[PDB]
């Protein structure tokens, strides 16, 4: 479930270094990679409600982080949603 | 000040937990309760039976000092576990010295094997050892003068469960309980075990290195149901018990205790059961078909209404004999199964 090489790849790709792992663009990028991974799991299986509640949880978590980032810095907000690809 | 703090760590330094430091001075004696004061919270309610030596009478007056034991604190009110176990440590030290000495020399006198090793008794205590330990070779102390004087040379000890078999005569010669539970197994290996707590259905004798035995209520004696084990044996006492059963799963070794006065009953069936021996016995309750003489050590129900005289049916034993009186009665039958001796009274001189 989003293996350690993938997480280190996304932290190093969106952050400052391999230590700045908790910034907002990094957390949004890990949540987005996780959601887009689990879309293949909820393509089939169709009934895993107990896992889809975790999916909806990290969807809302991503949305509140994006709402914070849009509220603080609109520049990196547009760079993040355009670098990442979302908003319907 | 720190006088008291230092005083506290001092008093910690000048006591220990087990029965090691002989400190309690006997400050009141009354039969049947001794009591000491070893620098603990209260004063022990000591039995008298942890302190009489080898013939029954007391040995220690006021001021005398034996250590007791510890590591158990407050059952409501009071302090200790008994000093007699204390003594066990001393015995262990002497045994260690012999093992340590390379040998231990005292006196060991072993007449017979309850469970395959002569019993050896050192000072007050008597211990049980595996069968080889009693004799160096195949000499066998059965031909020796009974309860003979040697020493004990150790043959075998079990090191966890306390069984020690020692070497009489021949002076010249010089997880854990439950995997291999086949040592005391085979049908009836007698053991010497201290009882712990009697749970009104049981007695819980358990000695052999971290096990549990019951001897529940059915055997215990040669009466079944009216017995109440607290009346009949003891609390905290080393007794005659053997296995009778070991269950591998469920971990319930079900020991017994009737393997004793059962023999007395057998002797009564025999001793006086050889043919038609006469007995002088006292009746206890006449139950309209007999008189129930029950003298001679627990032999149960006896003479029937059919003999009683030289008339058969009309007699009604309350009219003809007594209540509580010693009579002529001879044996006429001992039945080995179903525990019925059947005495009679017609064997007299009228016809």
């Amino acid at each position: 479930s989003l293996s350690t090489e993938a997480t280190a790849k996304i932290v190093s790709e969106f952050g400052r270094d391999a230590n700045d792992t908790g910034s907002t663009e990094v957390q949004v990028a890990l949540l987005t990679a996780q959601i887009n991974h689990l879309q293949g799991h909820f393509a089939e299986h169709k009934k895993d409600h107990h896992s889809r509640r975790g999916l909806l949880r990290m969807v809302s978590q991503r949305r509140k982080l994006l709402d914070y980032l849009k509220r603080k810095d609109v520049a990196r907000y547009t760079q993040l949603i355009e670098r990442l690809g979302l908003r319907r | 000040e720190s006088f008291a703090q230092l005083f506290e760590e001092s008093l910690k330094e000048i006591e220990t937990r087990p029965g090691s430091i002989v400190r309690g001075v006997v400050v009141a004696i009354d039969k049947d309760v001794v009591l000491v004061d070893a620098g603990l919270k209260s004063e022990s309610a000591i039995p008298a039976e942890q302190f009489k030596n080898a013939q029954g009478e007391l040995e220690i007056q006021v001021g005398d000092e034996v250590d007791v034991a510890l590591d158990a604190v407050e059952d409501g009110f009071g302090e200790t576990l008994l000093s007699r176990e204390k003594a066990k440590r001393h015995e262990a030290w002497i045994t260690l010295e012999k093992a340590y000495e390379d040998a231990e020399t005292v006196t060991g006198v072993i007449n017979g094997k309850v469970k395959g090793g002569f019993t050896v008794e050192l000072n007050g205590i008597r211990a049980f050892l595996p069968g080889s330990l009693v004799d160096v070779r195949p000499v066998r102390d059965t031909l020796h003068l009974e309860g003979k004087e040697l020493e004990f040379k150790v043959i075998k000890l079990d090191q966890k469960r306390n069984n020690v078999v020692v070497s009489r005569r021949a002076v010249i010669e010089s997880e854990d309980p439950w995997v291999a539970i086949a040592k005391r197994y085979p049908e009836g290996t007698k053991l010497t075990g201290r009882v712990t707590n009697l749970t009104d259905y049981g007695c819980f004798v358990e000695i052999e290195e971290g096990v549990e035995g019951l001897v529940h209520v059915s055997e215990m004696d040669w009466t079944n149901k009216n017995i109440h084990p607290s009346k009949v044996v003891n609390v905290g006492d080393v007794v005659e018990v053997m296995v009778l059963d070991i269950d591998e799963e469920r971990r319930r070794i079900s020991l017994g205790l009737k393997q004793c006065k059962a023999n007395p009953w057998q002797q009564f069936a025999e001793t006086h059961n050889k043919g038609d021996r006469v007995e002088g016995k006292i009746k206890s309750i006449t139950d309209f078909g007999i008189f129930i003489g029950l003298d001679g050590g627990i032999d149960g129900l006896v003479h029937l209404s059919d003999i009683s005289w030289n008339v058969a049916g009309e007699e009604a034993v309350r009219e003809y004999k007594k209540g509580d009186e010693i009579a002529a009665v001879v044996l006429q039958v001992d039945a080995e199964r179903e525990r019925i001796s059947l005495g009679v009274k017609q064997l007299a001189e009228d016809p």
Partner: protein, 226 residues
């Protein structure tokens, strides 16, 4: 100082948490009462005993404990004081109005049975009236000569005679007790943190109280007056 008796500390785990000022958890899972704080409270108790006994007041000694039974009688009849050691009757102080005529039965019955009709009626009547005297005698014998309400109550176990404390807190009697670790120091005015169940302790505390009483009743002022 653990002076001569051993009054170090108690039980194990069922301490009353109100006695957090007097604890030291030992290695054997047993509490140690703070003996360097016990002594100021005990001296604050004896300084009250000299005052209210030099008032010519009446101390009532209470402790049963199955072991401190005889230490109260022995260590209290040495003074001119009064004791209850066998059975604590419910209401000997706040229902003393009806304990009074039971005392009248005891005194008025040993008056009849030391010389009077202790043989004049029936052997069975002697077996009744005498058994009555040995029933009331170790129930009211120490309180027999009191004839009033006491001015103090010296309790040896608050946890065992807690109804004697509440008894003499319905009315205004200053009680004080040597408490254990599991006892409750609430009704007790002058709390003495120590050993309740040691014969050495109920010799020591009760003996020093016995010294403060008879040494406290002026033998000096009276002498001067004379």
């Amino acid at each position: 100082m653990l002076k001569a008796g051993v009054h170090f500390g108690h039980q194990t785990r069922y301490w009353n948490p109100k006695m957090k000022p007097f604890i030291f958890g030992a290695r054997n899972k047993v509490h140690i009462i703070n003996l360097e704080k016990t002594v100021p409270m005990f001296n604050e108790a004896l300084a009250e005993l000299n005052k209210i006994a030099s008032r010519k007041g009446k101390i009532l000694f209470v402790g049963t404990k199955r072991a401190a039974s005889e230490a109260v009688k022995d260590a209290a009849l040495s003074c001119d004081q009064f004791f209850v050691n066998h059975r604590w009757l419910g209401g000997m102080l706040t229902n003393w109005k009806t304990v009074r005529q039971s005392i009248k039965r005891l005194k008025d019955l040993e008056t009849q049975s030391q010389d009077g009709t202790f043989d004049k009626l029936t052997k069975k009547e002697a077996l009744m009236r005498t058994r009555e005297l040995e029933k009331l005698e170790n129930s009211l014998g120490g309180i027999k000569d009191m004839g009033g309400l006491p001015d103090a109550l010296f309790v040896i176990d608050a946890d065992h005679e807690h109804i004697a404390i509440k008894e003499a807190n319905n009315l205004g009697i200053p009680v004080f007790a040597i408490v254990d670790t599991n006892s409750d120091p609430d009704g007790v005015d002058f709390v003495i943190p120590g050993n309740d169940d040691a014969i050495r302790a109920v010799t020591l505390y009760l003996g020093a109280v016995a010294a403060t009483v008879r040494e406290g009743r002026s033998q000096d002022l009276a002498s001067q007056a004379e």
